[PDB]
Amino acid sequence: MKFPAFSYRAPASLQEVIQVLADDPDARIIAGGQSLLPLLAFRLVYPSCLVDLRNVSELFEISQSAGILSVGAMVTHFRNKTDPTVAKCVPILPKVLAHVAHQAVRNRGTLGGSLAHADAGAEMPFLMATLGATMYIASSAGVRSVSATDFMKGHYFTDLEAGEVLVRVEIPIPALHWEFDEYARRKGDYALVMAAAGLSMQGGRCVAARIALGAVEERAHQAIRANDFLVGKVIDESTAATAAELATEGLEPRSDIHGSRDLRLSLAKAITQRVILKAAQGAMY
Amino acid sequence: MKFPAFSYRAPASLQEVIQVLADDPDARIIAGGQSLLPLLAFRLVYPSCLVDLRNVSELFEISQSAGILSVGAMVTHFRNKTDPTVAKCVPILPKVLAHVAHQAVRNRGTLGGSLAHADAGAEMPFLMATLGATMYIASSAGVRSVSATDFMKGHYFTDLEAGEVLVRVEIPIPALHWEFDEYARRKGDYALVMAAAGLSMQGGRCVAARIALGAVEERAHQAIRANDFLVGKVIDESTAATAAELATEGLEPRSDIHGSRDLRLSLAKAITQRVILKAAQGAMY
Amino acid sequence: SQLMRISATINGKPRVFYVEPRMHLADALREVVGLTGTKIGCEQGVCGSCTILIDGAPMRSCLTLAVQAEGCSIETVEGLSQGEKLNALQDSFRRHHALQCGFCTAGMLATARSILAENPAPSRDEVREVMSGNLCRCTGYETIIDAITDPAVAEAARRGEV
Amino acid sequence: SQLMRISATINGKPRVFYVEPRMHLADALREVVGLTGTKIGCEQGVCGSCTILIDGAPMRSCLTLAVQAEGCSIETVEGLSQGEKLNALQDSFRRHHALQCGFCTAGMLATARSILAENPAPSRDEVREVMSGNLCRCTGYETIIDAITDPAVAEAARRGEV
Amino acid sequence: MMKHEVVALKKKSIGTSVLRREDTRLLTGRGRYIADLVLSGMLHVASLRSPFAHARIVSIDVADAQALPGVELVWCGADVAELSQGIVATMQVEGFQTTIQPLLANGVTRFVGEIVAVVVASSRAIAEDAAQLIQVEYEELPAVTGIEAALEGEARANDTLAGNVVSRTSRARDELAPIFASSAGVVRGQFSCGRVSACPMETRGAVAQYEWTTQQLILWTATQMPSFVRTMVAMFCAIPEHLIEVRVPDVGGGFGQKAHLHPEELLVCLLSRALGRPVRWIEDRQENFLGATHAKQQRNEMGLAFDGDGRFLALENRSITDGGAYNNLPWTQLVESHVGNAVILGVYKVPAVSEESIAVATNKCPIGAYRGVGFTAGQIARETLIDRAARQLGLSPFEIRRRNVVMPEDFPFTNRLGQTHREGTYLQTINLLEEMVNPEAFRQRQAEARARGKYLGLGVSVFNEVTGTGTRTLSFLGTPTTTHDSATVRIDPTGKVTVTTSLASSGQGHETTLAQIAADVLGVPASDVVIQAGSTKNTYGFGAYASRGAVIGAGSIGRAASIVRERVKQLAGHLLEAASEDIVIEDGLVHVAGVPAKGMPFAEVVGAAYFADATHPPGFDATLEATATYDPSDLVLANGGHAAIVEIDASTYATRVTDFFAVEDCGTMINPMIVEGQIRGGIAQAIGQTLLEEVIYDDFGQLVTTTLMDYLIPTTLDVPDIRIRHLETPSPLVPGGIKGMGESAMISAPAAVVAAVNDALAHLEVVIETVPITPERIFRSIQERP
Amino acid sequence: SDVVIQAGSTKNTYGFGAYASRGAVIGAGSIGRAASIVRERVKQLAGHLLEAASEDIVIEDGLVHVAGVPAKGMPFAEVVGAAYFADATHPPGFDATLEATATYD
Amino acid sequence: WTTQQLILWTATQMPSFVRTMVAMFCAIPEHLIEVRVPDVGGGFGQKAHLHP
Ligand SMILES: Cc1cc2nc3c(=O)[nH]c(=O)nc-3n(C[C@H](O)[C@H](O)[C@H](O)COP(=O)(O)OP(=O)(O)OC[C@H]3O[C@@H](n4cnc5c(N)ncnc54)[C@H](O)[C@@H]3O)c2cc1C
Ligand SMILES: Cc1cc2nc3c(=O)[nH]c(=O)nc-3n(C[C@H](O)[C@H](O)[C@H](O)COP(=O)(O)OP(=O)(O)OC[C@H]3O[C@@H](n4cnc5c(N)ncnc54)[C@H](O)[C@@H]3O)c2cc1C
Ligand SMILES: Nc1ccn([C@@H]2O[C@H](COP(=O)(O)OP(=O)(O)OC[C@H]3Oc4nc5nc(N)nc(O)c5nc4C(S)=C3S)[C@@H](O)[C@H]2O)c(=O)n1
Ligand code: SMO
Ligand code: SMO
Ligand code: FES
Ligand code: FES
Ligand code: FES
Ligand code: FES
């Protein structure tokens, strides 16, 4: 269970990190190491060199400007879950982070590492896409941007190309009131299904809705059918239930030792219905 | 019993050795280490740095030229006791070395180190003086020579000045026939008394004699009274006995736990008589 | 050379050790520095047996490269006891029988100190929540919760001596 | 660094060890290299217990600076046996009961090997003479003389295997 | 008493020269001695010693030493005094003065070499560096430099005592003046032996590891008495005994020196506990001469009266021991003169005796035990006087002894000093020794040596010796002490045997010989037996000393092995339908005695004992591991003789021991090869004591001999080839008839050499009664000839 | 606190180990049998010294005394010390061995 | 090899058993084998088996 051999570098600048990766195609980036080291322990990957981003200070920056929250790739789950700016701008973020692993892991894990790892059951890839965030990626050719949805293409599959570095994520401050929840064997456990609901109400009537499901399929599922159904309706138990059915119909979860396809769908429906009601509650009051 | 601290240098040239000793007054030379290290073990000396002569090749040379044997300061007792050149030029040297310590010590001890240490009980200081050898000493100013007799001034007392290096010893190929012997608790042990007898025999009659006693006093004792007495005599028991008395009269050995003055004198007389008879025997052979 | 010079403070003392990048911090502490108190139960970041404090924060040493300890202040179980006496938290573990085989104990103490540093007297529920990342196969957990919430532990924590 | 990098061959294998000039070879072999077969009984060159072979010649390691091992080929008692079997000389010591406490044995073997190298069948007197620099407080020496002059030892010596 | 039990055994391995199993690791550099031990975080101790024989310690400053990098601690006498008052040494002897030796001098030092401060540092070299930084102010006081001064001077060596006489005893006080005044003949001598050192090639050493989390202490020490050390550390350091384990690695020679409790052993334990890290103490050669123990220094003013036929009429002996500043633990100053006078009559019948033993304190390191202890001095004196008496009467040294030795017809015989002789070969030894020597030929060789200016001399020494030293022997010696020596024996399931002993080896072959004993008791190959020693975790014993290992080992292992053997016989008898008492075990076969066909292999019976419940007879105790202590029910006297031929050069006074003959009777020999090794080793040390060795203190109390350059021990050129012959008179008190002999040669061989020198110089009407006999002493003796 | 348990080495004793909830029981039985063997020898010595039958001697709170008469008692350590080092206090036929081994089932 | 002795440290619940089995399955004399058990971090029966 020992890591295979590799060299190590921790450059002081983003530009240098890019140069190292460009010069050595077999080199790989290491951020918090909470997802990469387990893979190394199993010898599932054989990097020639690990390039640490610990010394690239710009990647640790958190700032807000003109309605948008900017979070650097090396910002840990801990900082994101406790930072004042993040809390005031995007309160749904720290609430979602409460579900990510445990304290020890959140002390090293980063937003960028989580997004680049792209586990289909991870909270961040799901949340960023759902919040309509934008990722900024740097390479030898410059900096480019891509939407969070386009960034996350599948399980362990991102829009990232060889030699590229995720620098930061820009999150538009939401107008919708968001609530999140998920089903996990034990709090902290990788979720079988997760759901987020963002609502806007005019009195007791919904005027805007964004329902999304994660960990059910390889990418976040924006439940358009549900969104359109909730618009113009009073959100009560029966309505939330119907929206939940609309949000899960068409989904194709995979059966494994932790749950069959049917169980997954049943859970997806239950969790979605729950979060919708919770969102409507917070939105109105 | 552990040596005190010190730095170490083993220069590749004599001039560098001289320079180091000259630049640091507390630095001391180390050759075979068989006398210096024991002193260090007892913390009787506190050098700042030990300057090894192991890399000064010229100090290891043995050669002969115009009736004289040249032995470098770093020539080990072992080499002196087995080298062909030495054996043919000064056969008395290897016979004397058989009495010096034991095999292991002889494999490291050197002629130069023995002479510089100048133990009044050592064989080399006594022998070199007796054989009328010349020491060549190097310093920043150049090379000077001094007779073996002047070199050995007393117990742990030589003509060597601060920063000087004994380079080689030149021994005149003896015309006299030499024999040596000593009295030690066990062969190899530091002698209570040693004696050498160099004789020239024309027929069965002595024409020239050089009788010397060592370890009795702080310096070799050239028994002139005995030398003069032996000239023109047929050497037999009574004659060798009388010469032995003449050679030891006036001597003042130091009384210690290994022997009183009186014992020393009695032994010096017995050993001297023995070596004279032996030299007479070998000379006529 | 395959070894890298790493400078870090361990249990209050500046240390310098040489490690290859392929070695995780747990192994480095155990095999290079010689502090075997830190235990390894999975090397996957799940069991928490290797939990230690890095710059005051609990982290999995099996998921931290030894080389990543550069410039950090590490605290292992060996640094807890002051003099030759168990500190308040350790003594409480003993009084409440919060350990049997003792393999998970080093990690338990690390997480526990982290909790008490932020809150001297946490509720049993808060403790069970934060300690959920540390596995124990011998005790059933209850006594560990008891030990952490012991009044002597709370008092020591308030005085900053846990 | 007050430590010097010394390069020497020990028992046929090229070795590199770091030592201070103040440490003698006996201590370096024992404490730095980890070959405790070489024993120390006086540190004055008299007992012979630290006797080893340097470039084939017996020398007192307590009177040799560890730094003076540079460029030398050293043979300690650990290098004698081949393939987990005592060689002729060692086996002879055992058959003749040439050791008791065994403290002087490493040194005895070094000197004996040297003797046998020059003369495969030395006389008892020759052996007593050359071995006179190795002290033994247990045996009374007779059996060591017996062991060295054993005909099987002489035979092995002639075949260059002692 | 059950401890007296003498188990029965059939000799098979016992009596054969089995090659030593320990030799292989000891010939490959894989022996593991105290200095070879490596412990994590291990620290090193160095000592600062007193440069004065007797001085008040005005002040001590250790600030600079404590500050030197690498130094972790520096203690002076006051620091230690708070942890332990020191080594308390006493004896159940009327008038004996108890002494308490402080681990470190505190306020006053009582001998050159006493420790005044200790430094613990990262390395021994650095500890020594720091020790030289310590500043001590002394006020030299008048010291007691010898026996004369101790008895007649005003100075007192140890101020905690009342006078310098530590002990004074006289077990026999017959009126002899009229006998010496009227006897046909008289010979007298004022014999004196100088101090000597056991001088083992490996010096003393110990490493302590105290663990505060368990409160347990492990003390590794090169000792001959592990159980003793454990108990004393517990008592003198006030540490619970069960929390202490003493381990003994391979030891490079002991000879008695390592049969004492050393201040340093206690110190490392105290230091390790204080620092929370291992503390290593490995002394150098100078410290062994300065702070261990010295031995053999006694003066014996002896007189022997005899009739015209050479029959001994009386023996008078005033014995005085230079005991040093304190009593060593556990032998005390009684280790020399006191125990020596108890056996002063040796093998002879002497009707009238008057002797006194005096031990005096002097400002020197404490006198201690060294192979043969106090028996040696008197042996030298008596045998030398016996030879002198013979020459005076024109009798051979062998003949005068035949006329005074306890004869075969005499056993059992109790001499004037209460020693009862029960079984030995005294007479036969004298006769065999003479045959070996061939005096007729010697006389021829001697006469022909004069013509070459060489003085040849023959010396004879006949002895008996107390072995298997236990309670009974200690009582006889006047040093009452109850001993305890247990052994454990387990028969492993597959039929192999595991023996655990309290005996500690320092080269005498226990690892091999004890296995031979166990093998014979259980009837299995010695190769199927392993001896476990060097740990106090199990068994308890006084250790190896006083030639007791073979005896005590035979007895204890015998008893323990018998217990489990009986259980095997009971099970076998049950399966074979025969009484257990009728079952024997031989060559690994358990069968009805006399009927080999009615049996089963040992492994099969043992297998059933462990794993076949149904085969067990009713009331059976299936436990196949047992422990038992053993202590002989009476003295176990061994005997023998030695003859030495020496050649002295008339001109140089050089002395050479050209021949040595030995006759030994240690009852049944376990391993003849090992026994002869013990004899030759002892003979070499004897030559050392008599012709070369002397620890010398000058008129001011300074130790002038602290190196191997000034202290000469024998080399290959000092010891001749030795001829040995054996006689066996089995002891009925020890299994296999085994008797001891470890010290034999050092008790008697020295006498043979001294007697030889005197025989060599007899024609010059000169005698030499002081050892070592150096060229100076020979030169002086001859110069002062009449 | 005056007792220490040594385990983890096959140098002495032999057992099947800990399994099937047998430790407390097997330990109690075996240690009990072993301690009893040496306990009896202590009582035999105490009986001799106190002039009483061994079967009437009890050891409680480190005190060795006649049952019901803690007045004629001796501290445990004193009796043990005599067992080891006071040969004259031993009763006839006594086995002074204070270390024993026993199997239990 | 110089003593032919084997020391096996193993996290086992049955030391004597392991010692006897090593001797049997490896044909090594039992008296030359010592099994040592350090502190063990839980067994629950798993460490009550002889492992290859
Ligand atoms: C026991 C355990 C439980 C966990 N539970 C959960 C959970 O409940 N939910 C969850 O979401 N996660 C969970 N995680 C994973 C955690 O969130 C990881 O920290 C995260 O997935 C990876 O971030 P990282 O900073 O550790 O990155 P690393 O592991 O270092 O690596 C992430 C991957 O992205 C690459 N990479 C890193 N940074 C960049 C960058 N800026 N640009 C480009 N490529 C980059 C690396 O090369 C690697 O392939 C768990 C981890 C453990 C050990
Ligand atoms: C156990 C033992 C027994 C011995 N017995 C005897 C014996 O019987 N007879 C005998 O005579 N000797 C005896 N020796 C000593 C032996 O001969 C030493 O080797 C010799 O005295 C010193 O030579 P060395 O080459 O070892 O020099 P080192 O010990 O290195 O040093 C000797 C001294 O000379 C100085 N020095 C060395 N070389 C030079 C140079 N070229 N120029 C200037 N200064 C220099 C050093 O600085 C030092 O002060 C014995 C030694 C031992 C250990
Ligand atoms: N009948 C007998 C008697 C003895 N022996 C063997 O010879 C040995 C020594 O005999 P023994 O008289 O039983 O004495 P110990 O075993 O108790 O050994 C101690 C004894 O041993 C002597 N010899 C020594 N030899 C060595 N190598 N090292 C020491 O430290 C020695 N110390 C001395 C001193 S002092 C003493 S007291 C035994 O162990 C035994 O292996 C035998 O085979 N048969
Ligand atoms: O240890 Mo031996 O009796 S002097
Ligand atoms: O070790 Mo427990 O019997 S399953
Ligand atoms: S070993 Fe690190 S989490 Fe289990
Ligand atoms: S006490 Fe055993 S795993 Fe926790
Ligand atoms: S330790 Fe080297 S000769 Fe004695
Ligand atoms: S065998 Fe012990 S010193 Fe030689």
Do residues E382 and E344 touch, judged by C-beta distance below 8 A?
Answer: yes
From residue F101, alpha-carbon distances to E195, E534, F13, F37 in Å are 47, 20, 7, 8
Fold of domain E41-153: Aldehyde Oxidoreductase; domain 3 (3.90.1170)
Do residues A75 and A110 touch, judged by C-beta distance below 8 A?
Answer: yes
The total domain count for chain D is: 2
Final residue in a domain of this structure, among D31, D46, D81: D81
User: What are the chain F neighbours of G33 within 8 Å (beta carbons)?
Assistant: 10
Whether B103 sits inside 8 A of D58 (CB atoms) is yes
Distance of CA E134 to the CA centre of its chain: 37
Domain boundaries, chain E: 41-153, 154-196+294-423, 197-293, 424-466+636-786, 467-635
- E779 vs B43, B187, B266: nearest CB: B266
B29 lines ligand 2 (CB under 6 A): yes
The verdict on D15 and D73 lying in the same domain is yes
- B257 vs E123, E125, E710: nearest CB: E710
Q: Which residues are paired to E490 by β-bridges?
A: E498, E625
User: What are the chain B neighbours of D68 within 8 Å (beta carbons)?
Assistant: 33, 52, 54
Distance of alpha carbon E145 from alpha carbon E363, whole angstroms: 6
Distance of alpha carbon E774 from alpha carbon E655, whole angstroms: 8
Report residue B228 as tokens. 């003069």
Do residues B181 and B195 touch, judged by C-beta distance below 8 A?
Answer: yes
Do residues A3 and A37 touch, judged by C-beta distance below 8 A?
Answer: yes
Report residue D123 as tokens. 């006389």
Give the residue among A92, A53, A50 at the shortest CA–CA distance from A69: A92
Asked if chain A contacts chain F via 3 or more Cβ pairs within 8 Å, the reply is: no
User: What are the chain G neighbours of F8 within 8 Å (beta carbons)?
Assistant: 15, 36-38
Whether A3 sits inside 8 A of C24 (CB atoms) is yes
Could you give the dihedral angle defined by the CA atoms of residues F71, F77, F78 and F79, in that order, rounded to the nearest 10 degrees? 90
- G30 vs E25, E30, E496: nearest CB: E496
Whether G33 sits inside 8 A of F10 (CB atoms) is yes
Which alpha helices (DSSP H) does E633-766 contain, by range? 672-687, 744-761
The verdict on C70 and C86 lying in the same domain is no
Check if E40 contacts C (Cβ < 8 Å): yes
Report residue B23 as tokens. 């630049």
Which alpha helices (DSSP H) does B98-139 contain, by range? 103-106, 111-117, 123-130
SS3 content of chain B, % helix, strand, coil (to 5): 35, 25, 35
Is B239 annotated in a binding site? The answer is no
Asked if chain B contacts chain E via 3 or more Cβ pairs within 8 Å, the reply is: yes
- Amino acid type, E127: A
Asked if chain C contacts chain D via 3 or more Cβ pairs within 8 Å, the reply is: no
* Chains contacting chain B through 3 or more C-beta pairs under 8 A: D, E
Sequence-distant (6+) residues with CB within 8 A of A187 are A99, C129, C132
Check if D109 contacts E (Cβ < 8 Å): yes
G26-52 in b/e form (b: 16+ CB < 10 A) is eeebbbbbbbebeebbbbeeebbeeee
Task: Indicate left, alpha or beta for E97 from its phi (over 0: left) and psi (-120 to 50: alpha).
Answer: beta
Whether G44 sits inside 8 A of C137 (CB atoms) is yes
* Domain E424-466+636-786 bears CATH identifier 3.30.300.30: no
From residue B158, alpha-carbon distances to B168, B191, B214 in Å are 15, 20, 16
- Amino acid type, E553: G
Would you tell me how many other CB atoms lie within 10 Å of the CB of residue B218? 16
The beta strand positions in E205-363, using DSSP E, are 205-211, 216-221, 244-247, 279-282, 298-306, 312-322, 352-360
The verdict on C97 and C62 lying in the same domain is no
Sequence-distant (6+) residues with CB within 8 A of E154 are E142
Is A29 annotated in a binding site? The answer is yes
Report residue A266 as tokens. 């049943």
Would you tell me how many other CB atoms lie within 10 Å of the CB of residue E59? 9
Whether E132 sits inside 8 A of B43 (CB atoms) is yes
The architecture (CATH level 2) of E197-293 comes to 2-Layer Sandwich (3.30)
The verdict on C12 and C70 lying in the same domain is yes
Whether C43 sits inside 8 A of A7 (CB atoms) is no
CA–centroid distance, E512 to ligand 3, in Å, is 12
Distance of alpha carbon A141 from alpha carbon A161, whole angstroms: 12
Q: Which of residues 1-52 of G touch F (CB under 8 A)?
A: 12-17, 19, 33-38, 43, 45, 48
The phi, psi pair for E485, rounded to 5°, reads: -145, 100
Q: Which residues are paired to E27 by β-bridges?
A: none
Distance of alpha carbon D45 from alpha carbon B38, whole angstroms: 8
From residue E74, alpha-carbon distances to B132, B157, E209 in Å are 56, 39, 18
User: What are the chain C neighbours of A10 within 8 Å (beta carbons)?
Assistant: 70
The verdict on C102 and C138 lying in the same domain is yes
Do residues A284 and A234 touch, judged by C-beta distance below 8 A?
Answer: no
User: What are the chain G neighbours of E530 within 8 Å (beta carbons)?
Assistant: 5, 31-32
Method: X-ray
Would you tell me how many other CB atoms lie within 10 Å of the CB of residue C135? 17
Do residues E638 and E422 touch, judged by C-beta distance below 8 A?
Answer: no
C77 DSSP assignment: G
The beta strand positions in chain C, using DSSP E, are 4-10, 13-19, 51-54, 57-60, 73-75
From residue F14, alpha-carbon distances to A206, D39, E86, E493, G34 in Å are 78, 39, 41, 9, 12
Distance of alpha carbon E590 from alpha carbon E682, whole angstroms: 42
Check if E454 contacts B (Cβ < 8 Å): no
Final residue in a domain of this structure, among C40, C56, C81: C81
Report residue E625 as tokens. 């591991």
F40-61 in b/e form (b: 16+ CB < 10 A) is ebbbbbbbbbbebeeeebbeee
Sequence-distant (6+) residues with CB within 8 A of B57 are none
CB pairs under 8 A between C and G: 14
Domain at C140, CATH number: 1.10.150.120
User: What are the chain G neighbours of C36 within 8 Å (beta carbons)?
Assistant: none
Q: Which residues are paired to E219 by β-bridges?
A: E208, E246
Final residue in a domain of this structure, among C38, C57, C81: C81
The phi, psi pair for E644, rounded to 5°, reads: -125, 145
From residue C139, alpha-carbon distances to C48, C93, C146, E128 in Å are 15, 12, 12, 51
- The SS3 assignment for B49 reads strand
Check if D55 contacts E (Cβ < 8 Å): no
Do residues A220 and A122 touch, judged by C-beta distance below 8 A?
Answer: no
The phi, psi pair for F22, rounded to 5°, reads: -115, -15
Q: Ligand 5 site: residues with CB under 6 angstroms?
A: F 19-20; G 13, 45, 48
The verdict on D16 and D42 lying in the same domain is yes
Helices (H) and strands (E) in chain G, counts: 1, 2
Q: Which uninterrupted H or E stretch holds D113? A: helix D105-118
Helices (H) and strands (E) in chain B, counts: 12, 14
- Return the HEC string of A93-145: HHHHHCCCCCHHHHCCCEHHHHHHHCCCCCHHHHHHHHCCCEEEEEECCEEEE
Distance of alpha carbon E96 from alpha carbon E93, whole angstroms: 5
Distance of alpha carbon B204 from alpha carbon F20, whole angstroms: 105
The beta strand positions in chain B, using DSSP E, are 7-9, 28-30, 49-52, 62-65, 68-72, 134-139, 142-147, 152-154, 157-158, 165-172, 177-183, 193-202, 205-214, 221-222
Q: How many CA atoms lie within 13 A of C11 on its CB side?
A: 14
- Return the HEC string of E346-362: CCECCCEEEEEEEEECC
Check if E128 contacts D (Cβ < 8 Å): no
Q: Å resolution of this model?
A: 1.8
- Residues written for chain A: 285
Which domains are seen in chain A, by residue range? 1-56 (3.30.43.10), 57-174 (3.30.465.10), 175-285 (3.30.390.50)
Q: Which residues are paired to E356 by β-bridges?
A: E318
Lookup result for tokens 């809150």: C119
| Boundaries of domain holding D87 | 82-162
From residue E742, alpha-carbon distances to E98, E255, E679, E735 in Å are 30, 9, 8, 18
Which alpha helices (DSSP H) does C43-134 contain, by range? 88-95, 105-118, 124-130
Check if D111 contacts E (Cβ < 8 Å): no
Do residues E22 and E512 touch, judged by C-beta distance below 8 A?
Answer: yes
Q: Which uninterrupted H or E stretch holds E647? A: strand E636-649
- The SS3 assignment for F20 reads coil
Would you tell me how many other CB atoms lie within 10 Å of the CB of residue A157? 12
Find the ligand nearest to E375 CA.
4
The verdict on D91 and D46 lying in the same domain is no
Whether E490 sits inside 8 A of F12 (CB atoms) is yes
CA quadruple E7, E8, E11, E15: dihedral positive or negative? positive
CA–centroid distance, D139 to ligand 9, in Å, is 6
Could you give the dihedral angle defined by the CA atoms of residues A253, A254, A257 and A263, in that order, rounded to the nearest 10 degrees? 30
Whether C84 sits inside 8 A of E276 (CB atoms) is yes
Interface with G, mutate which of E22, E211, E490, E492 (most G CBs under 10 A): E492
Could you give the dihedral angle defined by the CA atoms of residues G12, G13, G14 and G16, in that order, rounded to the nearest 10 degrees? 70
The verdict on C90 and C68 lying in the same domain is no
Find the ligand nearest to B120 CA.
2
- The SS3 assignment for E188 reads strand
Nearest CA to ligand 3 atom 31: E255
User: What are the chain C neighbours of A101 within 8 Å (beta carbons)?
Assistant: 133
Give the residue among E701, E738, E401, E373 at the shortest CA–CA distance from E549: E738
Do residues E367 and E195 touch, judged by C-beta distance below 8 A?
Answer: yes
Q: Which residues are paired to C17 by β-bridges?
A: C6
Distance of alpha carbon D134 from alpha carbon D144, whole angstroms: 11
User: What radius of gyration do chain F's Cα atoms show?
Assistant: 16
Which alpha helices (DSSP H) does E464-528 contain, by range? 471-476, 510-522
CA angle, residues E331, E332, E336, in degrees to nearest 5:
85
Please report the atom of ligand 2 found closest to the CA of residue B122. 11
Distance of CA E36 to the CA centre of its chain: 25
The verdict on D30 and D63 lying in the same domain is yes
Sequence-distant (6+) residues with CB within 8 A of E685 are D137, E255, E371, E714, E745, E746
B12 DSSP assignment: S
Check if E276 contacts C (Cβ < 8 Å): yes
- The SS3 assignment for E372 reads coil
Whether E285 sits inside 8 A of D128 (CB atoms) is no
For the annotated binding site of C for [2Fe-2S] cluster, the residues are 41-43, 45, 47-48, 50, 62, 100-102, 104, 136-138
Do residues B113 and B165 touch, judged by C-beta distance below 8 A?
Answer: no
Give the residue among B36, B5, E127 at the shortest CA–CA distance from D21: B5
